[PDB]
Structures are given as C-alpha cells and as structure tokens.
C-alpha cells in the first residue's frame, strides 16, 4: 500500500515520517470509500469486461488466434482469458491498495522472461490490457475511470 512505501522510504532515509506523507496517508485513509467503490464495480462486471476485451483483442490482433500462433485452440484461448483475469485481479488489488506495488510483486517482475519461455508475444498482452482499460474506463464514471486508468496505464507501461 502507500503506507508500506512511505515506511520503507522513511527507513532508507533513516528518519520518521514527514507530516507531508502523514497527510498523504490521512488523505488515502479518507479516499478509501472511493477506491472501494471502484474495486466494487470492477469486481462486479469482470466477466463482461473480459469477454468484450478478449473479442476486441482478437479482432485487433488475429496473429495469436491464427494457426501457428500462441493462443490457438479452446484451452489456449481459455488460458489467455485466464491471464487477462489475473491481470484484472491485480488491477483491482492495486486500485484498493492505493499503490502499484502488489501488481509489481505478483505480476510484473519476470513477465518478459516467462513469456519469452512460453512463447507469448508480450505486446499482444499489452494490447489485451489496453482493451481491458478501454472497456473498464468506459464502464466507470470519468473521475473513477481516471483513477483505474492510472493503474491500467501503469500495467501497459510496464508491459511494453
């Protein structure tokens, strides 16, 4: 969360927490209801988001669903949607955390190495999280869409 990051910052600088970041933790504390609402709406409509985003990705980039591509077949397309499920789950975790660090710890360290192993094109995954971002911000109200799009934007930035 923001509190662990402020604590490791005050630890490496070997001082107490500044009143600026105490005010940051307090503002995060008061904005908990808005982030709960955002993560609530995202956990509500995860299937519709995944279905529309996967069909938009397959319409945009047909290489992955082509023969010889990565996600070819029923189980491979289902595993592709499972990976999109994991990434939307980490998006909700980072949305409720107030920080991008659980998304970093769980699903951003070695995604290039492991997708280099599986043969998955990583830019296709960046396009998938782009479509998930466009659909989820199409669902939300514009201010909350900006908040969720910050974390989605961070994920596609760490992808490509």
């Amino acid at each position: 969360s923001i509190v662990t990051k402020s604590i490791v910052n005050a630890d490496a600088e070997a001082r107490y927490l500044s009143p600026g970041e105490l005010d940051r933790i307090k503002a995060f504390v008061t904005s908990g209801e808005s982030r709960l609402r955002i993560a609530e709406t995202l956990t509500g409509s995860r299937e519709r988001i995944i279905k529309s985003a996967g069909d938009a990705l397959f319409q945009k980039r047909p290489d992955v669903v082509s023969p010889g591509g990565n996600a070819y077949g029923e189980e491979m397309t289902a595993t592709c949607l499972r990976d999109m499920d994991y990434y939307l789950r980490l998006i909700t975790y980072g949305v409720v955390a107030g920080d991008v660090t659980p998304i970093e710890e769980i699903g951003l360290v070695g995604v290039r190495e492991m997708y280099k192993s599986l043969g998955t094109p990583v830019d296709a995954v960046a396009q998938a999280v782009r479509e998930m971002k466009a659909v989820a911000t199409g669902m939300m109200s514009g201010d909350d869409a900006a908040e969720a799009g910050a974390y989605f934007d961070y994920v596609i930035g760490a992808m490509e």
Partner: protein
C-alpha cells in the same frame, strides 16, 4: 514488508480467491484504527528524543551498565546504546503505522540476536529499557495507541529473548 492491507491481499492471494467480505471487514478495521495510528505516529515523531531519554533515565541510568563494569560504560557504548534505543522506537512506530509486525521480524530481529550474543550485550537490560520506553510512550500518546505500541514492543522483546 507488508501492511495489514498487503497481508490481507497476500493471504487472499496464496489460496487464490478474490476479495471476500471478511477481507473488507479486516480492511475497514485497519482504516478505523489507522486514523488514530497517524495521530499517535505524529506524537511519537515529535517527542522521540524525550521518550528515549526518559526510558534510559527510568531503567538503565543508575545501574551497573551506565556505571563501570557494564556494557554501557564508555561513551562509545553509550552512544551505541542510545542509537539502539532510537532504532527500536522508530521501528516500533513503523510497525504501528503498518499494522503488522513483519517489519520488526524483517529488519530488526533478523540477526540482532547473534550479534547481541557475540558482542556480549545483556538481553535483560535491553528488554527492561524497551518496556520502560513502552509505558513512557503509552503515557505520552494515550491508551489504545499505547496498547498498539505495546504489542509491537512486546514483539521486539519476544524476538530478542
């Protein structure tokens, strides 16, 4: 390094489920504690030097340690002692803010035991000094946050002993 939030997310992540209502219950418990956690942290950050000097004046000052023959005799050892106490108080404040003693097990109590055995530091005097510091900060910042600091100081003592 995990908060109450990061430990909740971690526990829901190992078994593999999404956020359930009981996780939201723990999260709202953390928030309603966290407001007064912030005010107690500001109070401790304001008065840390007086807290440490009252802790050593309570327990360590007129004993054999601050006297000759103890491990707190020279000014080198006294400065190291005050620095050790300041670090205990600072990491207890971090654990109070995070709502999780994983930082105390991660950075404080990692190899502190064996260097305390190897340098010959008395564990009992340190534990007495930490407990004196505990009720000093309890009388300073209040009752409920005094209990908050109490379980984290007790976590440091249990990892030390």
């Amino acid at each position: 390094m995990q908060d109450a939030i990061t430990s909740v997310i971690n526990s829901a992540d190992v078994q593999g489920k999404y956020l359930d209502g009981s996780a939201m219950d723990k999260l709202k418990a953390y928030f309603t504690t966290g407001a007064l956690r912030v005010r107690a942290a500001s109070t401790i950050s304001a008065n840390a030097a007086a807290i440490v000097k009252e802790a050593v004046a309570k327990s360590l000052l007129y004993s054999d340690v601050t006297r000759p023959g103890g491990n707190m005799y020279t000014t080198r050892r006294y400065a190291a002692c005050i620095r050790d106490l300041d670090y205990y108080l600072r990491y207890a404040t971090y654990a109070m803010l995070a709502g999780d003693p994983s930082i105390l097990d991660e950075r404080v109590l990692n190899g502190l035991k064996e260097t305390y055995n190897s340098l010959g530091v008395p564990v009992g005097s340190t534990v007495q000094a930490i407990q004196a510091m505990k009720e000093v900060t309890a009388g300073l910042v209040g009752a409920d946050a005094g209990r908050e600091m109490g379980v984290y100081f007790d976590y440091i003592c249990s990892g030390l002993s």
